[PDB]
Subunit: 402 residues, 3 copies
């Protein structure tokens, strides 16, 4: 239940997710840039040229000095287009924007998966912490008992030394578990993206279900149709298929329309006088007759780039298939391994019960009961690593399934 | 023997290899693009300009409207070149294409080596599987015997619990080995690039030699001249050296010949009438007298980029040296370690013979024979990891040597 | 003491550091490129246009052939800038150069820390080598003693086999540690960047202090103000803020002054005769009245890019915070773990002393003394891995603190 709140908080506040959502807007703006090219551009132009072959003659100087002044609206090289290369560029930009949106969705799912993995690791670490703490308590109890026994002369110094060594060995394990727990907490605080993240997480471990234990993978086609990474690859392939059309349109003639409307005069004073309203119109037709490879090798570049995009799409499909196969195998194998470790923990607990019953009857010493404690507790914490790994494998399955 | 067939199949069908081979064609097409620039560009141009200072007057309107219409062939800004900057760009593109070819060769080698490594991992996993299966059988035999002994009262419940725990521990090892084997199979099917890869692999392990056990590394100079990544780095350095000449030629004057031949008239009706065949020739000589840093800082950019290219060449050489030295050290050390594990396995088998002889004589119980079975088999599988690591190290040495 | 010398040698000779220092010069050159745009550009221009409406007429042909030949100086489209978009791009290039300098500093620190870590790993490996060598010696002593005992019939063949197995196991550990030591030496020779690196290191490990043991992290704001990668991120954000100004200035009108001074004549012979000194001056005003999204969506692109840069800055801050937290936790935890392992080593040494005292008195056999040797030595080296990891964690803390 806390996972949904964590996911909502990440969606609200995560920084890389904000980066991806803004990249969506960036791709949208670039698509708008390319789409705006499809409409004619009109520009207000004010120009004045002053030229003469003799020298000096400035500010109404004494010569044949020519001056022209053109102010008005102008249609600047409107490409009237038989194929719509601009349209193909707009299509490529739109496909790029769609791919960016799909990549943002994939980043969102990846962030969710990372967060839940960190949470599961933290829970396992908390369980391990309680486990090793009580284990160290058991070790210290055994050390105290052995020290008291040698003080009475019933034990050699070798036994005291071995007890000390066992206690120190357990202490190192406790330190390692502390380091693991602190690193997990730091990873969670990094993932959540807020300085108050440590306040939003529960402080103690819980035995409740966190994520669904059994997931049906369905068919490979369903994985293909739902995973955002494959969708981004397909959209990128489509953008490349637009680029091939652009390079193909590069071959055909383009018609360009240059026009103007405004005023013209040889002197500034007559710039706004009656009868100065002028205009112009031109339709030029551009077609390199012989590319010499200049436009042909552009076609081969486009074709080869589209081929590389197709191969990238196939490779991403193969990577997705590998990921889902690995995740399914891990899920099944870790489920069975967790069953095995659960059986081991139950056997150790039964051994504890028998040792406790023997000791309370005065037949076995305190050392046997304490050692049973240590053994069953070590097995119970060893179960926890397998359980946490199974949960992380389930999360990896969920991610790799899209 | 199967390895050569796998290599041929990968060359025929691998997707990243197809990407690299297509990138070869892309670099070739780009080289053709840049080489086409060295030849004159002649384009067919048709233009019509209609302009006048008063307004209205459309479609032969009543004024001094000037209309000109020019249709013909035109040499569009042929840069006749005193230094051949275009030639330097063509050389840079050719060097880039050569570097792309070398990178494709390196990708081929990498894919091949990954294939052998995954295959060897699968073989080792199969051996480990047979091992742990029979080990688990041994554990069940011991558990059954201990259960039968407690049923008769000759064994305590503690012994039954320890037998159960050992059997459960062995089950976990079997599950881990199953996960490893399945992951190796998935890796192989990913690498081979075919859904029927699981049919192209033999289902059982073999003791036959797969790759040459003793390889002479030769000298480091031979490694430099044969490893494709160093060659790709050298070709990239050469392309940088060509871009140096490009930026250097950016300083010198360029001569640009614009030309045209076609028709021109004040009215459209006379466009194809006699006496309108016009021509034009215009050479321009371009040389910024004072760059102000505009052409100079380009020169510094080129020189500094060349220095960085030399540095990357040296770094790649150092990385290759590190890789080959590590591979040699690993080969020798894992050879000696495998010898050690072979000795351990032989000692365990001798203990097998002795324990079996003792048990068949009725001196030792079935537990001793079964425990010895477990021990010798655990040693035999522990040898297998070292052997597989040595084989993978040999494959890595092959990859590193080109 | 040797560490500062190693750092100095790396600064003098490292290749990636040379790459970064040269990238500083490259960024400086690009900044000079973009800054030189702020000044007017003058270019020597010589052109000759020969055109006429009929055909033939080459080399003073018989027609109305028009020839003009202009040689002189020309101010080519010098942009008079209302907003200084040129200034904004120069500022963006300057910020990029500053970011490159900071990134070079960060690369310097990273290379230093890598060198220190490799050196510490080599020291630990040397200690482990002496350790495992004497441990193997102990194993062979035990094997010889057990073989001599079986020759006399006082020991079974099973005991000889277990002794052989233990000796072979120890040999494998020796081989593994040899591989580790050789790989560490290879890493050092790669990092130092000189073929004579193996002559600059001590052949025997030392117990002296190498790096300071206690470091105060200070406050997070201090980490924000000193770590070079955060500085590079901030500088990149500033460069993005400058490109914001460039895209904003793209909206406003641009004045463009074109000018010329030189000679002009209808025939070549009069190119340098008196009375031909011509000049030209033109100030054009360019302002698209309706962007149509062409300039607006550029503004959106710039704003969204600036937002993405801000998010990148925040994410880099979070990454640095995570790194310093991990480093502090590791420092403390490995300090306490090293204390625990030191206590274990001391206990094992005391057990050694007691076992030697017993054996010299003729109470315990040689096997017990040899086993005490093996145990105390294994524990003493098990301390060494923790010590080396603590040193490496200190180095990581130094790197992550800038």
């Amino acid at each position: 239940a806390d996972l949904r709140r964590a996911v909502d908080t990440a969606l609200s506040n995560n920084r890389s997710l904000r980066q991806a959502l803004l990249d969506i807007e960036a791709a949208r703006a670039q698509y708008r840039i390319q789409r705006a090219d499809r409409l004619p551009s009109i520009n207000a132009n004010a120009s004045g040229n002053r030229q003469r072959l003799p020298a000096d003659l400035s500010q109404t100087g004494r010569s044949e000095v020519t001056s022209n002044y053109q102010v008005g609206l102008g249609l600047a090289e409107y490409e009237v287009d038989l194929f719509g290369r601009v349209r193909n560029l707009s299509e490529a930009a739109l496909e790029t924007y769609l791919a960016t949106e799909e990549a943002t969705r994939a980043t969102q799912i990846s962030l969710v998966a990372e967060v839940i993995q960190a949470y599961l690791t933290r829970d396992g670490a908390l369980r391990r912490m309680a486990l090793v703490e009580q284990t160290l308590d058991s070790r210290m109890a055994s050390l105290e008992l052995v020290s008291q026994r040698r003080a009475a002369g019933a034990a050699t110094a070798l036994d005291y030394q071995e007890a000390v060594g066992l206690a120190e060995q357990a202490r190192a394990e406790r330190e390692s578990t502390e380091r693991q727990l602190r690193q997990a907490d730091n990873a969670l605080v990094l993932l959540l993206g807020t300085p108050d993240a440590a306040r939003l997480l529960p402080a103690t471990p819980r035995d409740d279900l966190m994520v669904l234990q059994d997931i049906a993978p369905g068919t490979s086609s369903e994985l293909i149709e739902r995973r955002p990474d494959i969708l981004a690859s397909e959209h990128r392939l489509k953008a490349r298929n637009a680029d091939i059309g652009a390079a193909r349109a590069a071959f055909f003639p383009r018609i360009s329309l240059t026009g103007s409307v405004g005023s013209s005069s040889a002197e500034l004073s007559g710039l706004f006088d009656g009868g100065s309203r002028a205009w112009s119109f031109a339709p030029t037709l551009s077609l390199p007759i012989f590319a010499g490879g200049r436009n042909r090798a552009n076609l081969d570049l486009a074709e080869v780039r589209q081929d590389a995009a197709v191969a990238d799409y196939e490779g991403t499909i193969q990577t997705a298939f590998r990921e889902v196969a690995d995740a399914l195998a891990a899920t099944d194998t870790l489920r069975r391994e967790e069953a095995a470790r659960q059986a081991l923990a139950g056997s150790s607990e039964a051994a504890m019960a028998l040792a406790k019953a023997r000791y309370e009857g005065g037949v076995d010493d305190y050392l046997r009961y304490l050692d049973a404690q240590r053994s069953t507790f070590s097995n119970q914490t060893t179960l926890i690593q397998i359980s946490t790994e199974r949960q992380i494998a389930l999360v990896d399955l969920f991610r790799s399934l899209g």
